[PDB]
């Protein structure tokens, strides 16, 4: 218990006992904390509790130092000094924002705003506190037990009484009982196990509540600007394919860390892999939160980088399927592709962190703790989707508050901006450029004349809280009969329940906006489903319409976003 203060680093024996993370607080900061919050328990080698037998006084403001022990007002000896006096709490080696982070329930957007506008040490305290809160909230949910096994992909569940039921979607991953991780989609429910096991009745599922480790490293290391490219050796012979990013790869070698805002289809993966061709002797660790984002970088590296110097790090507890073409778990390879949670303790000449809007400050800090690099490159787009904040239910989380990297890209601007979209028909590029990019995203493709929009509110039904709009799926069914080229389209919507109904009626492959991020399809059929803050979110709208290479059909509920779509309007 000899540590450093989380607000001014002043060494102390004091730790707040009411805080879920028990931060070390100095004599002056422990006081401003206990005097302005319900948090009154103070800890050291021994807690600040009354030493008199059977006495339950633990409030530090009601306690005194009786020589070597602590006593309340009713038990203190004549020669006793209060623990709280002169703006200090008695201890060895003798903040409004710290109080709000220590006592908030993380259900409001203002909680996340603060966790990102506060000092660096408070961002790590905020990130452990939030993650610990999120993990103890997983215990609140009830146990699901297999009642009847219908087939190899359908079952019927029996839920625990008294405890709420967690939302049935791919967002929530259960642990079977240790028969492997499992997931469900909606009394006919679909069951998907990470490990193929002959489903037994009586075997139950519980959400994987993992221990929240403390954070040591900052979210962002302190910025360093250099006059020359440092520790990296460029090629003079640089492939014409990657010539557009040569000035940007040099900016990467002349700064400790750099930010790259890359709208959809502007060449983020190409920039990331081309940085390896530009610094060809440099050891690069490629990281992202999801296995899908690490795999998309693995796909781009298979096409340009030597496959024998590549390695895909897969955690021993292999959850879902991964990239198979690289030698697995060879930590020492020049190119290592790995998710943030599976990152080994290693060093690199460059660390590339992709899909930065999906990172949390907890993820940012983990990467700085496991990887010691000469250069760090953060690639993503703050106009794309952030990580789901399971506790947040009141207020909207704006892009400048997703993480430190996004906060920077939205305030001081990004260091590098990929300004030309090569994926989308110009109708889509023109819509999202005006919507989220201040008219600075340019269209490489021409207008495809295959981008359509329909204003159809339909009928909104609900499977618990996940929404369905059957008349919107019916309008799509009518459209498909008249436009059979759209047979190979991917169906996208903001709700998995709309996607389950569209899968059975249309037969199209189905994807939620959130799971479609970073993917591209020739044709996209999007039904807005509802007029909610979730379905009207401009970042989600931006991701939804930028998945299409050739054509898109948008069946809209919101007049604002429908009027903003620079598409050909249809009728029926
Ligand atoms: C030369 C400086 O360029 C930028 O900062 C790029 N900026 C364009 C408008 S945006 O897409 O809204 C935010 C990114
Ligand atoms: Zn302090
Ligand atoms: Zn506290
Ligand atoms: Zn007492």
Q: Is the CB of 439 within 6 Å of ligand 1? A: no
Helix orientation angle between 120-137 and 96-103, rounded to the nearest 10 degrees: 10
Cα-to-centroid distance, 33 and ligand 3 (Å) = 7
Cα-to-centroid distance, 5 and ligand 3 (Å) = 13
Determine the atom of ligand 1 nearest the C-alpha atom of 436: 12
Residues around ion ligand 3, judged by CB within 5 A, are: 16, 18-19, 39, 102
Ligand nearest to the CA of 57: 4
Residue 406, annotated ligand binder?
Answer: no
Ligand nearest to the CA of 32: 2
Cα-to-centroid distance, 276 and ligand 1 (Å) = 25
Other CB atoms within 10 Å distance of the CB of residue 419: 14
> By CB neighbour count within 10 A (0-12 exposed, 13-18 middle, 19+ buried), where does 474 fall?
middle
Structure-block tokens of residue 363: 């993820």
Q: Which residue has the tokens 């750099």?
A: 258
Burial 489-498 (b: 16+ CB within 10 A, else e): bbbbbbbbbb
Structure-block tokens of residue 303: 């096409």
Method used for this model?
X-ray
Q: Which residue has the tokens 């006096």?
A: 85
Cα-to-centroid distance, 303 and ligand 1 (Å) = 30
Q: How far is CA 371 from CA 3, 36, 216, 221, 343, in A?
A: 24, 38, 13, 11, 8
> By CB neighbour count within 10 A (0-12 exposed, 13-18 middle, 19+ buried), where does 265 fall?
buried
CATH placement of domain 421-564: 3.40.50.300
- The answer to whether the beta carbons of residues 411 and 367 sit under 8 Å apart is no
- The answer to whether the beta carbons of residues 516 and 542 sit under 8 Å apart is no
Q: Is the CB of 112 within 6 Å of ligand 1? A: no
Closest CA to 348 of 281, 412, 288: 281
- The answer to whether the beta carbons of residues 153 and 183 sit under 8 Å apart is no
Structure-block tokens of residue 50: 């009354």
Residue 458, annotated ligand binder?
Answer: no
Backbone torsions φ then ψ of 19, nearest 5 degrees: -70, 135
Cα-to-centroid distance, 34 and ligand 4 (Å) = 19
d(CA 184, CA 182) in angstroms, rounded, equals 7
d(CA 162, CA 545) in angstroms, rounded, equals 41
Residue 72, annotated ligand binder?
Answer: yes
The conformation of residue 24, written as its DSSP 8-state character, comes to B
3-class secondary structure, 15: strand
Q: Is the CB of 66 within 6 Å of ligand 1? A: no
- The answer to whether the beta carbons of residues 169 and 466 sit under 8 Å apart is yes
Strand partners, 353: 287, 378
Q: Residue 165 half-sphere exposure, CB side, CA atoms within 13 Å?
A: 13
The conformation of residue 272, written as its DSSP 8-state character, comes to H
Q: Residue 230 half-sphere exposure, CB side, CA atoms within 13 Å?
A: 14
């Amino acid at each position: 218990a000899v540590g450093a203060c989380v607000l001014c680093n002043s060494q102390t024996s004091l730790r707040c006992g009411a805080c879920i993370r028990r931060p070390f607080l100095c004599c002056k900061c422990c006081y401003d904390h206990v005097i302005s919050t319900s948090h009154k328990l103070v800890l050291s080698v021994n807690p600040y509790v009354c030493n008199a037998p059977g006495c339950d006084v633990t409030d530090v403001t009601q306690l005194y130092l009786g020589g070597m022990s602590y006593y309340c007002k009713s038990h203190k000896p004549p020669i006793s000094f209060p623990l709280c006096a002169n703006g200090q709490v008695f201890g060895l080696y003798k903040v409004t924002d710290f109080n709000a982070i220590a006592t908030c329930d993380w259900t409001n957007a203002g909680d996340y705003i603060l966790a990102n506008t506060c000092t660096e040490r408070l961002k790590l305290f905020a990130a452990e506190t939030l993650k610990a809160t999120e993990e103890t909230f997983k215990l609140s949910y009830g146990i699901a037990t297999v009642r009847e096994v219908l087939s190899d992909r359908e079952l019927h569940l029996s839920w625990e009484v008294g405890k709420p039921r967690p939302p049935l979607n791919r967002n929530y991953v259960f642990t079977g009982y240790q028969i492997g991780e499992y997931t469900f989609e909606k009394d006919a429910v679909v069951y998907r196990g990470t490990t193929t096991y002959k489903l037994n009745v009586g075997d139950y599922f519980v959400l994987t509540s993992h221990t929240v480790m403390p954070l040591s490293a900052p979210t962002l290391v302190p910025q360093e600007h250099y006059v020359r490219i440092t520790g990296l050796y460029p090629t003079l012979n640089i492939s014409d394919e990657f010539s557009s990013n040569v000035a940007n790869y040099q900016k990467v070698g002349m700064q400790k860390y750099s930010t790259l805002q890359g709208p959809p289809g502007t060449g983020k993966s190409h920039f990331a892999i081309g940085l390896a061709l530009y610094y060809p002797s440099a050891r690069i660790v490629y990281t992202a939160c999801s296995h899908a984002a690490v795999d998309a970088l693995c796909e781009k590296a298979l096409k340009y980088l030597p496959i024998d110097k590549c390695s895909r790090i897969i955690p021993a507890r292999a959850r879902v399927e991964c990239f198979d073409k690289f030698k697995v778990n060879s930590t020492l390879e020049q190119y290592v592709f790995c998710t943030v949670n599976a990152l080994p303790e290693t060093t690199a000449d460059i660390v590339v962190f992709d899909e930065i809007s999906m990172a949390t400050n907890y993820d940012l800090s983990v990467v700085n703790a496991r990887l010691r690099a000469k250069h760090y490159v953060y690639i993503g787009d703050p106009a794309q989707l952030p990580a789901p904040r399971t506790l947040l239910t009141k207020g909207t989380l704006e892009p400048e508050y997703f993480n430190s990297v996004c906060r920077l890209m939205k305030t001081i601007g990004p260091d590098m901006f990929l300004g030309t979209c090569r994926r989308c028909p110009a109708e889509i590029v023109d819509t999202v450029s005006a919507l989220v990019y201040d008219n600075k995203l340019k269209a490489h493709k021409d207008k495809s004349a295959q981008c359509f929009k329909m204003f159809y509110k339909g009928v909104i039904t609900h499977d618990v809280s996940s929404a369905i709009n059957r008349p919107q799926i019916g309008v799509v069914r009518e459209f498909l009969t008249r436009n059979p080229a759209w047979r190979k389209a991917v169906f996208i919507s903001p709700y998995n329940s709309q996607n389950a109904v569209a899968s059975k009626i249309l037969g199209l492959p189905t994807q939620t906006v959130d799971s479609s991020q970073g993917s591209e399809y020739d044709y996209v059929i999007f039904t807005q489903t509802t007029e909610t803050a979730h379905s009207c979110n401009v970042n989600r709208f931006n991701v939804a319409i930028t998945r299409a290479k050739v054509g898109i059909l948008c069946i809209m509920s919101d007049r604002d976003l429908y009027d903003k779509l620079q598409f050909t309007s249809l009728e029926i």
